Design a protein around this nucleic acid. Structure first.
Ligand SMILES: O=c1ccn([C@@H]2O[C@H](COP(=O)(O)OP(=O)(O)O)[C@@H](O)[C@H]2O)c(=O)[nH]1
Length: 380
DNA sequence: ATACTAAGATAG
């Protein structure tokens, strides 16, 4: 047994790094370990309430509570750092952050996970080079990437088993006329391809489309400037949502993760159209990818992403397996629509497919396999 | 152009 301190020096953004952090805590605890979740409250974000953490996470203001922070990160056997201060923070914050790195007990094994898989990243990171100099172990999403002592690979795991046994519904309860897209307002999440698809196929067939997570950040202005039809709702107005036929895309903003899993488990189809560049592509799928195969719905993933990510077991393209995963192709959206109405009539098939994906995604990124993988390297 | 990005003010 050991004490682990998970540190998010950037703050709790409420996305994959926060998620990863929560799933990381769950696993250590599940394997009999003490975990303290600490985050720097200097900077504030929006999706702060998207994941449940308030009752156990420990905030700290680096620019003003250095000693509190020092006491915190030095009270453990293993320090895992998942994020670092952003470029928009004050000198005192980044500076005091760097001062923490220099005063971490020589005995504490410092493990650093580089969660950003974009060249654009690392630029929005401060004190990154000092974190790397003190790290005892480093993990990244890809070897053939921008980032590149010894850098190991990892996948952001999730307890897919748990999610199923909580939300997985009975086919007879899944409305085949609802298409749900989840992600956020950045172009590579594929929100345009989703708006198109609805306008060209989904809407016509009196089907419905929902898109959760599109925050009205500056990026949202492009959607407006292009005059794309949509009806906007907040989490408290999710009741006014019009799930009728031939309607425009219903857009929900920053959503609660638990609630989303519920609405999804009762949805004929779930869309995750992220299209990341193969440089930073190896084996890592994204949380929203694994949340679809787990809640019990047919997963529509971006075709070229599957063609670029390797399966954890054999190291081969994900698209070269019978996952029951519908690979969305921007250059053949009608064929993709085929495999959809198809499974949307023979609910018997739909259910023999959603079972195939869950097993596939389970074998690929469940915490049971991945964290054990990462734990062996940390303690190697 | 194209791809990626919560910037910033205010009410509660
Ligand atoms: O408004 C939102 C948007 C996303 N998420 C969750 O936050 C995580 C985001 O991680 P992912 O790897 O899917 O993408 P990222 O946002 O980190 O690029 C996923 O578990 C989503 O279900 C959420 O709870 N609310």
């Amino acid at each position: 047994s050991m004490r682990i301190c998970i540190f998010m020096a950037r703050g709790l953004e409420g996305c994959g790094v926060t998620k990863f952090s929560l799933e990381q805590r769950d696993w250590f605890i599940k394997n009999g370990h003490e975990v303290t979740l600490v985050y720097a409250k200097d900077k504030s974000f929006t999706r702060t309430s998207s994941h449940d953490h308030k009752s156990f996470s420990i905030p700290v203001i680096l620019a003003k509570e250095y000693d509190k922070a020092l006491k915190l990160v030095n009270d453990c056997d293993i320090l895992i750092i998942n994020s670092v201060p952003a470029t928009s923070v004050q000198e005192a914050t980044i500076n005091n952050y760097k001062k923490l790195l220099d005063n971490i007990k020589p005995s504490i094994r410092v493990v650093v996970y580089q969660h950003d898989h974009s060249v654009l990243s690392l630029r929005r990171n401060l004190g990154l080079e000092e974190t790397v100099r003190r790290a005892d172990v480093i993990f990244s999403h890809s070897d053939n990437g921008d980032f590149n002592p010894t850098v190991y690979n990892f996948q952001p795991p999730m307890d897919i088993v748990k999610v199923r046994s909580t939300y997985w519904k009975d086919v007879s309860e899944i409305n085949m006329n609802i298409n749900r897209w989840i992600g956020r307002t950045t172009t590579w999440k594929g929100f345009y391809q989703m708006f198109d698809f609805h306008e060209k196929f989904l809407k016509p067939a009196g089907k419905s489309t929902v898109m959760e997570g599109l925050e009205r950040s500056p990026a949202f202005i492009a959607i407006k400037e292009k005059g794309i039809p949509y009806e906007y709702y907040g989490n408290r107005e999710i009741d006014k949502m019009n799930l009728a036929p031939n309607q425009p895309a219903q857009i929900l903003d920053c959503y609660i993760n638990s609630e989303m899993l519920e609405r999804m488990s009762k949805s004929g189809f779930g869309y995750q159209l992220s299209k990341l560049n193969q440089k930073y592509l190896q084996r890592s799928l994204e949380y929203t990818h694994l949340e679809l195969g787990a809640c019990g719905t047919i997963p529509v993933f971006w075709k070229s992403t599957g063609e670029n990510l390797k399966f954890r077991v054999d190291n081969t393209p994900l698209t070269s397996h019978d996952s029951g995963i519908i690979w969305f192709d921007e250059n053949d959206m009608e064929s993709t629509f085929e495999r959809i109405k198809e499974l949307s009539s023979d609910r018997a098939l739909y259910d023999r497919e959603r079972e195939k994906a869950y097993e596939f995604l389970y074998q690929h990124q469940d915490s049971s396999f991945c964290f054990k993988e990462q734990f062996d390297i940390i303690t190697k």
